[PDB]
Amino acid sequence: TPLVHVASVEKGRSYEDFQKVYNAIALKLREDDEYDNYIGYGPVLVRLAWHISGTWDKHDNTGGSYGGTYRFKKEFNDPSNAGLQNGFKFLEPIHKEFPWISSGDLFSLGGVTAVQEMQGPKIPWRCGRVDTPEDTTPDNGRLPDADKDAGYVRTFFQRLNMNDREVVALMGAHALGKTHLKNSGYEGPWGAANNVFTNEFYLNLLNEDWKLEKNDANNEQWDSKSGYIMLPTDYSLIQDPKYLSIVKEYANDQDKFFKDFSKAFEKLLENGITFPKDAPSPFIFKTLEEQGL
Numbered sequence: 001t002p003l004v005h006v007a008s009v010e011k012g013r014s015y016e017d018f019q020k021v022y023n024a025i026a027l028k029l030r031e032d033d034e035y036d037n038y039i040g041y042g043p044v045l046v047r048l049a050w051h052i053s054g055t056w057d058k059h060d061n062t063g064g065s066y067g068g069t070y071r072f073k074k075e076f077n078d079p080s081n082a083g084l085q086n087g088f089k090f091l092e093p094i095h096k097e098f099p100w101i102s103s104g105d106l107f108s109l110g111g112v113t114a115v116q117e118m119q120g121p122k123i124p125w126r127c128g129r130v131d132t133p134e135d136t137t138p139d140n141g142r143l144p145d146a147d148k149d150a151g152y153v154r155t156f157f158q159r160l161n162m163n164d165r166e167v168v169a170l171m172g173a174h175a176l177g178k179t180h181l182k183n184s185g186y187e188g189p190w191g192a193a194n195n196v197f198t199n200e201f202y203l204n205l206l207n208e209d210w211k212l213e214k215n216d217a218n219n220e221q222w223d224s225k226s227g228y229i230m231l232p233t234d235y236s237l238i239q240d241p242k243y244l245s246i247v248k249e250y251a252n253d254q255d256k257f258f259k260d261f262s263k264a265f266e267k268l269l270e271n272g273i274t275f276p277k278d279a280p281s282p283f284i285f286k287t288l289e290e291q292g293l
């Protein structure tokens with residue numbers, strides 16, 4: 001019926017092997033710090049990890065992170081993926097150094113590494129994704145539009161099995177990076193520390209005086225006088241009463257937010273994968289910093 005995607009550990013690799021891929025991505029983050037005006041590639045790696053995981057359809061088990069399908073042209077040239085090709089190019093040299101890691105395993109660890117090296121919470125991660133054939137590549141159109149409202153978001157997230165708490169926890173990833181006109185028809189960052197992982201997104205959403213305006217791509221965005229932005233989907237988080245009390249909780253307690261995000265991000269990343277009972281437990285990688293590097 002629904003595909004079954006069983007996780008299979010890369011033959012003969014253990015924890016230490018994966019700690020090494022992580023340490024390489026980390027060292028590389030540290031080093032190419034000039035990208036996107038000095039934001040670094042942190043934010044674009046997190047976004048690449050969400051986008052390869054977000055094509056998942058809980059109905060027939062297609063899409064999701066398992067197959068590393070982003071490596072194929074169809075997925076790669078998905079208009080909603082515009083701009084991701086920068087996270088790809090960044091990880092290529094790494095893949096060439098550790099050729100035994102599957103794609104989906106690399107693309108997902110990149111997201112975890114970014115968060116943790118950007119001072120986020122530790123995200124437990126699992127190995128085992130296996131590259132599948134070019135024909136298992138999901139058609140374009142499964143990632144969410146940004147010009148919509150809270151019911152649109154609730155609905156969309158439901159296909160990925162995420163509830164309210166998970167959607168608001170994931171969304172605060174919007175503290176990182178920024179929109180770029182050329183990629184999405186949106187322009188501007190969400191906050192000021194856009195390369196440190198904090199609950200900043202929620203404080204802005206609650207504390208700024210936002211104005212609705214149209215941008216040069218002729219799309220509407222919410223503009224703050226501090227120079228921040230909020231897409232319609234972000235904005236929708238304070239329109240809905242269920243979402244807004246959760247926003248508040250997070251504006252109010254960065255810990256809580258970190259715990260909730262950790263859990264939701266892992267789930268997002270393991271959606272669609274069956275892990276045998278004998279599969280190793282999830283790894284918690286040390287940062288560069290905890291390793292003294």
Ligand code: HEM
Nearest residue numbers: 043044047050144145146170173176177178179180183184
């Ligand atoms: C309805 C849900 C979402 C919508 C409509 C949305 C839309 C967008 C758009 C339009 C951009 C800007 C692209 C560009 O021009 O570079 C963006 C960037 C980004 N997204 Fe979201 N996104 C959503 C959810 C997520 C989630 C769940 C995450 C991770 C949990 C995420 C992480 C990011 C990051 C980190 C960036 C910044 C990337 C950079 O600086 O290149 N977003 N998102």
